[model samples]
Target: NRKYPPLPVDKLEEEINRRMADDNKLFREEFNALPACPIQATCEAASKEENKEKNRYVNILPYDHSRVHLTPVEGVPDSDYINASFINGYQEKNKFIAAQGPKEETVNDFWRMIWEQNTATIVMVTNLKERKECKCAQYWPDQGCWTYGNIRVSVEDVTVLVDYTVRKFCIQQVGDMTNRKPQRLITQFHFTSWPDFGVPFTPIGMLKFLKKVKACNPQYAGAIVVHCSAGVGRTGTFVVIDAMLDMMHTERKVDVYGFVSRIRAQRCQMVQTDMQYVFIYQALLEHYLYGDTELEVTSLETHLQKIYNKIPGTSNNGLEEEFKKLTSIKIQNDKMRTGNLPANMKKNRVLQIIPYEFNRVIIPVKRGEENTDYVNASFIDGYRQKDSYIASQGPLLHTIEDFWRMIWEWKSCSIVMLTELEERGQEKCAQYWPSDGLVSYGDITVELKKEEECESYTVRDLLVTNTRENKSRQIRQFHFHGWPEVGIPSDGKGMISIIAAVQKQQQQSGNHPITVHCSAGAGRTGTFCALSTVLERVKAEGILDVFQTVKSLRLQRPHMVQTLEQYEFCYKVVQEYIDAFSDYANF
Candidate 1:
């Protein structure tokens, strides 16, 4: 019963090897620069050691304190909490929650998270216990819905396949009143035969399985709850592949290192082993090189093929639509930051700015690190491009920790410094990092590895370490030296070069925000952020308007393009980039 073209094997090996050569460095760096998980930081919600007893494996723990931990029953008087994390999948907006298989004691909480979060999909990658070891709990009802405290869990339908099972579970959480009761249907894709701590020998079987799981709803419909034994190994594997396929398809490129790093930043031990990293390249390589995508184009190949093929195809919803939507964003003058302060950022003592309420970057930190909050930066959405920037202040002497802290938390790949640390002895900004050696700010140890001087800007590579955790990340810094505090870049060429450099380095971060700064974080920072945004905005629509773009940019971060001079500079740079666009088609 063959339906489509059977995959050809020869194409797989050659294509896989070619891509592997490019990704060889990324794979190695991923292993070496793995971030630390903050599991020792305890949660106020869960204190019982008994919850750890229910864990499928002992070593894996959630990073930071923000995972989707379950609340104990209102009157149950329990001390333990469930193990699960809400992983942001692609642009799904924190739509996937990774979890360990439920222990018998926590089945009700498992169902509770599913119900409370309104999750629509679940991917169970392991069966109940392997060998004599318990892998997961038998949570789904075999025939009818089963009551777990206040929630009812029932399998409404089941579709069995050679490799996986698709079950429909109706989750209902009862409330004291009719108005309080909540219910929703969730689809579970359970892979039956995946071996412990490994991937399928062949790629198509698992790819086909993921295709079925993704097809159940819109990508952003609801949180897709996924679990294995411990949840990190296979759970990380599935989401990494899922998000990159998205990057490849939508953005016309993929960054194996960046996306994996982005995930590891969000959750602990994503794509758990070196082999898991190898599996991704192998799957992507084999498919584009040799797999029979044309014979039967399932959902699997459509997204995966886009990642590897880099084929010229537009999105279903055109960029023009996004542009049109962006254009409609007229400035709300009344609410624009005239001079407002978040009452609490004052507590941390970092200032000269606050992020616009709508779009703020939360610095990820362990316990006791909350006092180190409020870096003077705001996230700006690029013209139509998303995850585009950071408009931040030139570091004050005391806020240097906040600045470097912002860089590490954003997983930012590049720093575009627009001001010299000192200007004619006025000291416009603090000397934040070593021009030649290592520097320390609080628990962060920064080492200057290399410094390359360019005609207009200097490129500095530094190794940053979390002193307490002993984890290190390499950050590339671009300092544009000629730009004055109150004026535009001395030359548009320098502006263009620095912008190009920042973006080129940023490519390694996929869509992670890049740090852009100058004195006060608004004046010069606004000029560059506005300039880069208009450059990309016009590239999509063949038009440019600084008035409208600045209006939109300031909405994200108040006081953007603070002076009339900086405002005019944005237009000049955009015009310059346009004049040169035809010469560099790739640009």
Candidate 2:
């Protein structure tokens, strides 16, 4: 504390956790203590007769002194005004230009200010439209060049990532013959996933986006431009978090409250909600304590070797510690009073493995269904898609009709059965479909059209017809028998084979929610969902986030990837798959 860093690495977690404790009481107090910038300071410039149209929102106006002042144009009136302010970074003055997303009339003014300020990077945190409402205008051209005032903006290249999009533009003054160098390469980092109404699902994507922005811009380059709808909520959140991160690195102690208070003095309503304020601390804690766990598939082998090392005299490794931390995380909206209802309680196979009402799938029993909506299934979101999977328990003899009705109503083409009919002298999952001939479960008829046996799994082609509607549809069920009844499988080939076949059908069937189930639908079922999600993420971004994947799965369903062994198996599967596809020239 006296010599090296003010906040020790060991003590950092406690400080952040203190603010986050007891429903973030300290965080709320700190946010409330922040000074509210007065409207009088902004009234002079923003309330001017001509500049009123330039302001995005009447309430969210930049202060007169700290506002970014543009050069007066030859013929244009109020050219010096643009609803943007020069927000100071940790210790640096004028490090960022916090501005509003371009409006239809102010599009030219935005380009003119960017050209004049010699800005190289622009961070857009809001989208053009959200929930059918226009949040921001399409300021840049989709293709080629579009003249915004004197600046000719040409789109050079664009790269789309899972959470963000990178757009490179070449900007030049059209008729500036006197100036020898008029062209400048501009980079726009568009964070696409941040919601307009709420905070992002996680801060990992936002942190990665800031990393990319810093990498593109030089250290002492012009002030980076940041904007959202009003340029305060998302914009201030980004700016304060970025600056505080720099402070943590340089000064080794962060003053999040002090930094947030300072930014609001420059612009009103910065970091709008208490939730956004809490997220700033959360993001910083993630950076300082947890660090980025996402790694490339190519480097997974090396990563596995490091994590597999045993700690001191204990048999547990990093994987065990990781799983412990993962399970300790408390998910919001985990209440299951609806699933605990007297009527719904009897429908559950396992008492504790109940679905969260927020993510549970509702089945309409009749036209205007009342009590029939309850089903022991939860919608699990995959890597990049929402509601990509419906994880359910193996059908009970009493629930076979409901299962078939769910399949028919949901229009699902694939069902992945992870457990057999019986395991270790106990019924694991009921045989819901026919073996060799047609069978009826209530109004749904299941006919065995074909059957094929693979090395580690079986494929059953079944025709499902609804007697109520007199409509027939074909669905495939992939039944894997490779997993041992007692323990996790030592081999990953069977899991991989089943995954491939399931995905092939998913691709052809328009990526519908693939129904997956084991006996309890929380252990093996969650493992499959986690593995599938991580595999897709690895293939697309070359990064693996198994911890986050499993953690997210648990939020959708109770105890997904239930055991330590099952959690460990997820890593094994990923490792084996990566090794199989490894590019080896020597071999």
Candidate 3:
């Protein structure tokens, strides 16, 4: 019999709905009832006067019952103590070592523990620094080899993905080369999106990271090492998710409360917050609902065919089911915005689609105006840089001046227009600029210099002048017309061509955020942004993660890639790009 058979696909939807029905009330109750269970397991070794310098946080020490003891070096006292605990997996014993990030003095001890315990995989969940404070040390070298006490570590190769990075490291003892002992291959999965003292906005990225970690080691030959800054908050969250997923595979059910309670007995404060506990539930539900959607260029065609396969007695296919599950997952709903404010309500093209207050692009209040600061545009990140694109609705008749002011103030050089002024005999967007003549929106003057027509898009060269400041800058808008207002384009080449033009302009203009907009700025706007970002990532690393990319976009702005069809269109566009260019043949 298979040790951990897969969950039957037929019962997934019903099971997920049943758990989500409480709306996480059950999860909160379970988390609330968890006992503190503090200080029962002693930390005498971690609290020792000589070992005090080895601990990162005085209170966050590993328990004596399960602490990882290191080999003592000659003349060193209390050298066996390290802030690490051996944690059990679902049904496996000592499957993980939850440890603190390596400190400067303890870097050698960190490597020494790894060598002694035979750890092949290391999962780092926190950055070296966060909020202008050092959370973890840079224990690994940027390139080449660095010696940590008796161990020699070398960076073999690194593969950077959308949410995490995979580093293949080669390690050996200082005398191993002379003694004829071979070097060990160690794989490090560094997850970059997790914030300190909190969970991620969604669990898709973290789940994907977990899947990658599992693939690196189908069966654990050694304990998998996991760490965050304090080694309890994020590290515990990661361990519990991994263990519960495994438990679900074998048992067809999971008890998050029981798992957390068990792990906390081994290490204090495992699964640190109520929110993180809730997240573990959400992640488990998501995993059972949608297994995995990551695609590589070579396997993309096969994946598309499978998703498009029609089910028995129904016209719908797997694509629709996958899309429904993705949309059903809950996102953060408490985002604050001023779009509903009395002064800014009329400026919005749609009442429901609003910008996040934190990331919403603010146009400087025009000298004396009170409400001039509000706009429907938000600073959307691109492939490489933060705030690399401004996702906005088409400028309204009254908001045109504010839109131009946003363009001038942000020093943007490219405008990617994903919709036409009118669609299907209805006004979809207000014409913000002139076709062939000079026009002024308040103090900003727009002059059309040239226009070029493409197979599926058009390019407009325009000069924008600020009459008040007597300064002007040239901006180009690439308007796409191939995509229908209601559905996706019949072909992906048209979309790809438009993105090629937009990206070229962005590179020439330096690192300013490009302005992108459609009718409501969420549907076509988000689709275009996700496609561009994913395409660049594929070009760099040859990996595709539309699910994680879209999830991140929705966190920044509401309803990104608004429809199942638009979400599916992203896959189609990336596939078409690979087909047209032979450079990715190796992928």
Candidate 4:
């Protein structure tokens, strides 16, 4: 039961052969050229060989600001190498990559490395000849050569595919090279300064690279993979540039020395050349301060000030002074305009009454409740409500002083109706009664025996005949309100008719002040006043600030012109008058 069967020789041989073939295919042709031996034995020998070769070459010197490294071919002269080094160094420092060949394998491998590692690898070869000459000879499979510049390498292994060159520079050969033809190549490289390129290494190119990588990688597609030929100089340079470019792009000013120091621990001296260091500074400065050739001195000052302010105990006094100096002159020259005093100011003040000639004050009244409604509607349509109505009263009287003087001198006044108050009888009389007061003059007065007696008074009889000609003024002419028909003309139309009759009386009286009043000296009184004022102001001012004029009236007398509807009516009436006949036109 414990015995085991012998192994099958044929099956074992087949399994071993299958494994060998797989291993061979995975390792590539280079691996096949190595000495044939057991796997462990070959690996041990290879490790020993690698160790032996490690010490064969001398240590490479750190990069120099003024010089570039040049590995010359056997036939090339030392001076040629030096010149080439300068050109190469300039390109390398500025992140330019020269194209080498159009071979598919070479180009695919170069691009594969760049894509896989997420690094900024550019092709800077010109024609077929130059393509075969560059180190990355196989970078462009289809094109003979490619030119690259502004290489920004990222620590995160980000790759970028630029469309066009945003930056460019020319190389000038000195000395004996003058006889040789100078060559120029346009290139585009990854712009790392757009966003930061340090640990995060999120340059725009890097981001795009990472996105592609994520799509391609089998295990960790989206994750980044970092590597370089030796994983040191060029690698470190790429990572640092990428980081620095990102930082610059994002407008971050991180410590360059600190960043380099940290990177050295991971891969050794990242930025090998002094020229490369200067290149970074220049690139950042160019991108942030000099882009588009706009020298914004103010912004520069502010940036510097911000940095300085970060220092403990720094003050902004100088900045404040500069700001004030720049802005002070403009402020000093501006002036303010003065406006006229409001019209209501005089009306609001109490004044002494002076007696003068009494002109006919045509007080138009509605005879009944129906008439009252019509009158109200007419005034409302005219927009004479509230302050506008009240203020307009001034223009209605033309000159208050003139009107008051006329009334004081003449003493006698008149109230005219379009219809007879006696015919309408008591009902109409009640609505339009003048109250208990007699007609009073400065010294002369006429008492009424009964309320009906007041109704009999006419404008002609009161002002022209009744009062004695002692040169003493008397208010003799008076009448009660009435309508010619029940509702035929309508109260509103009748009221308008009555107002028209009063206007006719004023004309006949020859420019006298008429004392027009209603019960509260507001509703009906306001309507008449507003109409008269609009007529007067339109004639005087030519144009009026309607709202301002109305506001002034409101301030002078509370509830003088009370309602919005009435104000609207007043406005309409004035507008119609203006539209029909210009204020300048004679009526």
Candidate 5:
């Protein structure tokens, strides 16, 4: 037994024939000609009448409409348009749904009703005729919904129209529909009319419907039902467009003709005009070509590289040159000169000038026999003082070594040394003398002598005489202190003493080594030696390389000129003397 009662076969035939005759007459009147009818009638007049009744019959049957509804086969929804069934025995096996209706009618209202009653689902879209609030007891009755083809639909109706599946009642209304309410046998989907006054489809509404379908499908599984009014024409067009959009979203191929034909076979004609079909094609093309808008580094790089590679004659060398042109270039110069003086000289030196601070050499002297005693005594005291100072400043001396390493790594040259003197009263001074007669470290040396002894043959005289005679370079000596003088002059004065010594030595033996020494051959001797070397180097090169020269001297002699105070004293006094020479034209 069938669930629905069967219609009277004789009455059905008579009604079908009468509708066919009316359709044929209307088609001939509108088109001024008659189109072919597939169903042959018992007579020629009947056949001609049937040809006019195209829109009266629903063209789909079991074979063509099998999978057209939202029903699930086993479990999966019938996404493809194959094996879909329609209301009547008509089937669109090869033809598109657009050509299924009567040529006289623009909309197939009767066929649409049949499809709505028979098929589990259908989709539709239509132009808005009018809209008004419903007096019926519905949640949104006060807020009237949009009208499509003179039909009012709720949000739930939109969902059903889009997906062709039933959904559980989530809203409370007069019906008191809640979870307990039977799920509506409506297709899940979205619906809207064309010529929307520039309004695009609300993405939010579509997303909400999709979410609802996903949530409710598991509980009350059913096929989605979609409809506007007529199942063909406008309705068919809407369904076809939706399917095409879905295909694009799922990365499927867009075959316009095949898609339309499949829809026609299941229900009826999809697109009504060539313009509409063209619009669908354009939409798909736009989506396929420009859908991806994300920016990625790899893609950018690849695109740039491709463009670059396309340039003619762009070889590796050319690319390299281009890169170089886009970058910046620089040049550097770091050359240095240095010297190292003996450690013995460094220990005794007064250090009248220090490169790190003041830059002048001075030697102070006292007058009379008492002054001489005081000066010699002070010399011995200064010797012990130098040792104590070096001992206390041991850490500082090591720090200097670190500075030396830095200069060495940088390829900078340096000069380091110790200085001392020889005097008749101090025999221990001989131990301070350079064994090779050359300070053999620093580039220059100086020997200071007593004034009388400078002319007489004393130990100073013998030493100077032997140095000049035995060595290839002439030896020069100066007389800064004699019996008449006393302790060395104060700060700048002592520096002057050494300066004078160096001047005299340079004058006496041009380009030859000058050895400067004093009593005990360690204190004043070291001072004169250090000063002489500094002056000699500055005269040879320029003041710019002075630091390099000092560094070299310190390296060869560990405690060379061992006191920071002495180095400072030397620097200050040397600057004073240099200023004094400012008046001289040569300076």
Candidate 6:
């Protein structure tokens, strides 16, 4: 009876009506479908950030090792990090791989992962584009052959079907002169009907597709690679349906919601859209009522009661208590001393929005300088940790010369710019670098050398040559486009991503401080510093003193946290990190 609960002949048709009528219910249904946050009492349990930080996901949400994965090829040294996860198939013995469609840079890694793992069948549940946007790259070859690393993939045969396309690929790892040529066969089941965020119109279409995959079942016992772009939306749908349908066939009962819960733990963010979630229900019902498949419906068995009865849970999920716990304490004072030291009032003069100078960077590009001696920045000391960085306002047109002087003279190499150059047509930060070529900022000549654009940030190489000293040094500019000037980054993932990149560069950037900036600098800049410090403490020390970290951060800058909205986002992001990556942080 657990198989979709014995609905009427047309219950799915009925549900379509209800779900379509009330968009409000749609949100609630989706939210209600999953469990809540892990750190229920206090949202302080975020794991310290790491390179999974540079994860190229949605400018929307992020996935933690919460399992398998992908990374840019040249960007990281490891080839094993394909954006793929091993997910539960039907039961505990079920082995499935839910993977994001390959990006251009990661296509090789994607194939390598499949090749190394001896992946038998690949299920591609997307087209080249969804709604006119590129969902995933053409990872496989169009016709004859494609070589990803040492793995050479050649098309065996391509079968065109009404609803999907099946391409057979002979995957062979090209051995050296010493090693023999070993080959494996793999099939790609490409579903064309489903759109991103949209549901399958009829289960008959999907059921036929699933049946086709079952018939072409691979000889290899390893994970079957299933993917859609970003790997969660349609990929999640296919995996969940197959898993649940498999369990129902063997076990004689099923819990659609419960099955998704179990798989999501291994690969977070499955059945990405509510439409995808409800699709499972409709498809199962259609099978139960109309279709004649191996997954034949059985009488509701109380023995399988354990499956349906067990409540699916999230260790951390809700946003209400997250906000409540984060905002409970109103921080009164955290400054070291009052403003306007020396001509500190003059330092305050350069601050974009702030009026006073309780927190300002004391170090200048050179000693015994007048106007060049001043930069609108502050040193936020890491709390209970040894890390530190300079938080500064975005360069004004006048301060561009001063900022470059600060960089070249102060011997700093890496720069972290948090805010956008502009927001809603308002100039937030100056387009301070050359629009194309070299620009002279006082005595230092700045040239843009190399640029690698990432999903959230751009990694740029800059060579700064001091004309007076006749010395040249290289500085990296990691311009994060995701974080907004007035608002937040599209998500906390970007915030964590940019900071992790900064930290990586900072370690290599030498003894000089990193030049960090935002529009006002104090607002987003300070928030970034606080999270970076907190993530650092949690990673190395296994603790989150959002309270004390902000206090310490504010000690260096009066207005370290810009807005309460941004303030609240930090806690949410941290909590999610902690919940998703509990054990990984301690290292």
* Candidate 2 clash figure, as a count: 0
Which numbered prediction scores highest in lDDT against the true structure?
2
Tens digit of per-residue lDDT, candidate 3, span 76-147: 878898899998889888889999998888899999988888889999988899888988888898899999
Off by over 4 Å in 2: 1-23, 38-43, 141-162, 167-186, 195-198, 218-221, 313-315, 331-337, 362-365, 398-411, 436-448, 462-474, 584-587
For residue 73, give model 3's deviation from the true position in Å. 1.7
lDDT of 4 by residue, 43-152 (tens): 22212332232211123211233222233325533311111011111113322221112233223233333332333323221222322443222232122333321112
- Best by the TM-score measure: 2
For all the candidates, what are their Cα RMSDs to the real structure?
22.5, 4.1, 4.6, 38.5, 43.1, 22.5
TM-score, one value per model: 0.44, 0.86, 0.85, 0.23, 0.24, 0.43
Candidate 1: clashing pairs of residues:
129-135, 145-154, 392-521
Clashes per model (N, Cα, C within 3 A): 3, 0, 1, 66, 113, 18
Model 2 lDDT per residue over 86-173, tens place: 9999888889999999899989889988988889999999989998878788888889999988889999998866578899999987
Off by over 4 Å in 4: 1-461, 464-512, 539-549, 579-587
* Model 6 alpha-carbon miss at residue 142, Å: 1.9
Q: Candidate 3, residue 315: CA error in Å?
A: 5.1
Q: Tens-digit lDDT track for model 5 on 1-587?
A: 12112223224333323423543342133222111222222222212333333223334222322323222224433212221233221121311122222122323222232233332232323322324421111212223342322223334432222212332222211222353332233332323324323211112222323344334434322233343333344444444545655654554544445455545444434444443444444344434433432222224334335423534575544223323321211110110011112321242323322221110111122234121111111110010011111101111221222222221222211111122223344332233223343332122232323222322112222122123224222222233532112334345654565455445544554322232333332334444445554544334322312222222233222333333334434444545555555454323
Those runs of model 6 whose alpha carbons end farther than 4 Å from true positions after fitting are: 1-31, 36-54, 58-66, 69-76, 293-587
Could you give me the TM-score of model 2 versus the true structure? 0.86
Comparison by TM-score, 1 against 3, better one = 3
* Candidate 1 residue runs with Cα over 4 Å from true position: 1-33, 37-51, 77-80, 175-177, 180-182, 218-221, 290-587
Query: What is candidate 6's TM-score against the reference?
Result: 0.43
lDDT of 4: 0.31
Candidates, ranked, lDDT: 2, 3, 1, 6, 4, 5
Candidate 1 lDDT, 230-325, residue by residue in tens: 787778878877876676567645555566666665566777777777687655653443333322112322333443333356542322332333
Superposition TM-score, candidate 3 onto the true structure? 0.85
lDDT scores of the candidates, listed in order: 0.66, 0.83, 0.82, 0.31, 0.31, 0.64
